[PDB]
Amino acid sequence: NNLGTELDYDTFCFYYDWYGSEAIDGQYRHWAHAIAPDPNGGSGQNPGTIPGTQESIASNFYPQLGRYSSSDPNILTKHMDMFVMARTGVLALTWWNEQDETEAKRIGLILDAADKKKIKVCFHLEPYPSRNVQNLRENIVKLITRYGNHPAFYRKDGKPLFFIYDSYLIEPSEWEKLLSPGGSITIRNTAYDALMIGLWTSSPTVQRPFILNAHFDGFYTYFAATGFTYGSTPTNWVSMQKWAKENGKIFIPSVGPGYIDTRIRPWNGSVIRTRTDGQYYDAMYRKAIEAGVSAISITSFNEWHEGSQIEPAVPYTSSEFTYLDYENREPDYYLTRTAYWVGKFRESK
């Protein structure tokens, strides 16, 4: 078919599976959340908590689906239909190495729901405690062993793909052991080889040698807030793509519709980026496409704490908070606008 409605399998949408309900999980997990102290605000802060009641959740926005469980198969069905509306072919799943049966069950439910709609799943490896290249190798082996034969498990040209959040927390000399073909614990030329996409943060003088010396296959930028880092400044993307092409690396810039996290980080207002009825999203997605990249990542499907979500949100005013909403646009506007941009990306590819 040539309908301009099919999924794009070079479009990755960052997905969070950490939401709970009392009924399914025993607690409205993540809808309830600690308020972060001000890192510049001195001693004796008791910033408190957001209780995750219907009236008071840990977001400046409010989900159309309410305080949902990430383990609810009926919610997962609805999320996969939203990925189909957005034309986002890859769900990039946050992964925290919880080593608990509830994580294992939830990952299997997500893979099962994804496959019914031809959506693919890859893992976004988070900075879990004592993360190092040896336990990363063990965890890559475990994820490929457990999920590699699942029909929804993502591959690009025969290789799994992992995003590595805060990859700079690990020295290039350690990465080399995992990611150089000669490394002491290499995955290259093994059953467990993968495209490893590291997080480009700061200036080229730091990041270029880091990416080369660590033997990453590519890099992404994550942050939805323009200008937060060098990497999340879209005017740098043409030059970052030029360097990527010259050095055989895959650049996957991250685009988002806005940013606001002041319910959980009240001191962080300088990072707010206003959605302006979709104009912010349009500008950032246009910059990614114009850079001439092979793949794009979206921050985020559902990081509700950071206000980067494309998941439908509804107007809500409670006795405790007046939520932001998608203003002059309908709740599914960011899903249908994502589909528009996926079409422009494919026209460019």
Ligand SMILES: OC[C@H]1C[C@@H]2N[C@@H]2[C@@H](O[C@H]2O[C@H](CO)[C@@H](O)[C@H](O)[C@H]2O)[C@@H]1O
């Ligand atoms: O997926 C990458 C990051 C996306 C988002 N900034 C958060 C990071 O997680 C931290 O902050 C969360 C609240 O926004 C908090 O719930 C979590 O426990 C933190 O690790 C992600 O690492």
